[PDB]
Design a protein around this ligand. Structure first.
Ligand SMILES: [Ca+2]
Ligand SMILES: [Ca+2]
Ligand SMILES: [Ca+2]
Ligand SMILES: [Ca+2]
Ligand SMILES: [Ca+2]
Ligand SMILES: [Ca+2]
Ligand SMILES: [Ca+2]
Ligand SMILES: [Ca+2]
Lengths: 393, 393
């Protein structure tokens, strides 16, 4: 059938497409410059359709003279969410990002990143002679590869789209798993820092050239940037502001924080990854005693990088994944049965307290009572299955 | 917030659940019996809600005396689709399955499975003294881990649900990737065959005990089975026929075959996996010349087992994955541009012929014309973007 032929051919051509949209940041050593180089491409959606490609070429070199770590080839995987602050009248961008290194199979500088670190970002820009400045502030938590920042245009209206400045506006906050610690150039250059340079080519339009110094200034990690843009088209997608601001309709920041809180219950040592030991501990606390081999089988089924642990993005993938309605309903049934330890059909305050304390939460009886109250539609002091379903929905 | 607490706790409890629903068939050597053992659990959905668990314990030993391969620990991953033949009046089950071995990181008997092999299945059963028989016929294609069979109840009405007999009713058709060939017990026992025994425990209900001989009889692979079921409840989920027949609403058999046809265009040697060399060949034919390292990066992004190639289930996952509407639209735009080699906005018969011949299809001009005709709504002899969109939708 001609329709059969079109389908099978279309699938093949689309498969080529899915394979070659490499979204990752590919890093390799630049031994001559005692640093690293990277290349990657960003796909900016165009309002009302189409994509604007931005080809990135990157080089980093240390600012100071102490030895640094030069890596084997690897990549960073980035998930970014852009949003707006409803009360902010200035031109602005709120950003949440998670970045994790991978691609390799299983000190001083590192130690500076074990907790939450305040960030300042300053950019001075000139695009086609339009001068502008951006200031940003927020925090990074490398344990999770997490960045949270807000940026403001301090010169009025930004003359380019905010998404085009994301990559310019601190790869030292990437999570490198334990087996790749010796490949983390960025933290190895700290505190003295590194210079990051890029050229960014917007296809069929102009380019940005950037130079940044990234370093500690006391206890703050500061990214100070100069940007020059040339050859842009006045009514192209960049100077003409034709790019979409955010992706429809990425899972909410709130939901991410809820998942992070949940993840923390498993990651007992706060190292940003769940091990078989940690998963066993949680399961034991709730009365289930799988063997070490069974725990490893469990983790493997969701361990996308084969490092044998579950990191936060891997946990998010597992939790974000599409379930058939029947399956979602049964998963909620099963969760109810975990809470309802005596199997009588009602979750009591005692039972709730037991589950939360065993997971490792610290709640008073009064806090547990308030949780029951929020769910207890019929006022009997316990949470039945219908009430539980509404709470989880 | 109490709602925040419920969410975060619910997520944790559901995460435990997602981790521990190990669906895979876990295999290990049974050195004393010169064979293998396996254990796994099947979740049968109950009509109107709930799941009926079926705990499987399995042992296999060779029928003949020639040496066999005893494996390191590993697993099989199974995707099954059940359907009904609209013209079949007998109680019946149509089954499509894909089974692939994994879990290990990177002769005579094997050779018997390089092409499509006809299968006969015969079962004689006794459940709570209800005697019944099943006959099945179809084909297996181990290159893809693929089985296609139809089964009939030859004694009238089947006294148990068809899904409960699936695992009973030829693991020699599993795909073992090249790096795991020395761990394939099942093919190593051929042609003389193996005995497969199981006990299957249906929670809160009875059990099946099975014994099967699996072997070649001439050029047909035959699975001859005796099944005894005891301790079933008359109005339980099994004898009471309370189990759902098929999963809502798995991607169609037709669509799978279309994807298989597409996959075959890449898998030039017909070995059931796409290598970097093969992907490069296809991309080259269409005018794109990525380096070997780039091809490896491409494959890695979708290579879920880290073997460095893409097998058919991995291809299906890649193609089945949820895309945002904007992304789906842009992927179709991009595919149009591949077909429209001269960029004039119209795909000509010449251009279509070029794409299909380069992918490795063999079509006459008349067949290409018929494809254009099916898509060419406005009768100008070419396919414009709107026409292409309707064809791909
Ligand atoms: Ca941990
Ligand atoms: Ca992992
Ligand atoms: Ca209870
Ligand atoms: Ca209640
Ligand atoms: Ca091949
Ligand atoms: Ca693979
Ligand atoms: Ca054309
Ligand atoms: Ca036309």
């Amino acid at each position: 059938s001609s329709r059969r032929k079109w389908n099978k051919t279309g699938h093949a051509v689309r498969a080529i497409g899915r394979l070659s949209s490499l979204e990752n940041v590919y890093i390799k050593a630049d031994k001559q410059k005692n640093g690293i180089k990277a290349n990657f491409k960003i796909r900016h959606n165009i309002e009302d359709g189409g994509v604007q490609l931005a080809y990135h070429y990157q080089q980093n070199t240390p600012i100071g003279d102490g030895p640094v770590l030069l890596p084997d080839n690897h990549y960073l995987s980035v998930q970014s969410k852009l949003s707006k602050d409803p009360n902010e009248k200035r031109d602005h961008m709120v950003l949440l990002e998670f970045v994790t290194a991978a691609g390799i199979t299983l000190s001083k500088g590192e130690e500076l990143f074990t907790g939450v670190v305040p960030i300042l970002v300053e950019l001075d820009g000139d695009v086609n002679g339009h001068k502008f400045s951006v200031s940003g502030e927020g925090e990074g938590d490398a344990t999770y590869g997490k960045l949270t920042l807000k940026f403001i245009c301090t010169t009025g209206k930004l003359p380019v789209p905010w998404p085009t400045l994301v990559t310019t506006l601190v790869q030292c906050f990437s999570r490198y798993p334990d087996h790749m610690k010796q490949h983390d150039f960025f933290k190895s250059a700290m505190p003295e820092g590194y210079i990051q340079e890029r050229t960014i080519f917007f296809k069929d339009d102009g380019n940005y050239k950037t130079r940044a110094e990234v370093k500690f200034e006391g206890d703050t990690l500061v990214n100070r940037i100069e940007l020059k843009g040339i050859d842009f088209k006045e009514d192209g997608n960049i100077l003409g502001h034709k790019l979409e601001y955010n992706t429809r309709d990425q899972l909410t920041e709130e939901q991410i924080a809820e998942f992070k809180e949940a993840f923390s219950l498993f990651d007992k040592d706060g190292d940003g990854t769940i091990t078989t030991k940690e998963l066993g501990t949680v399961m034991r606390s709730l009365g289930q005693n799988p063997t070490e081999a069974e725990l490893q089988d469990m983790i493997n089924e969701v361990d996308a990088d084969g490092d044998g642990t579950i990191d936060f993005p891997e946990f998010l993938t597992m939790m974000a994944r599409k379930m058939k309605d029947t399956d979602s309903e049964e998963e909620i049934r099963e969760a109810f049965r975990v809470f309802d330890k005596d199997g009588n059909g009602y979750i009591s305050a005692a039972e709730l307290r037991h589950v939360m304390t065993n997971l490792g939460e610290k709640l008073t009886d009064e806090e547990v009572d308030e949780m029951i109250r929020e769910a207890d539609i019929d006022g009997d002091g316990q949470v039945n299955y219908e009430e539980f379903v509404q709470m989880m929905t």
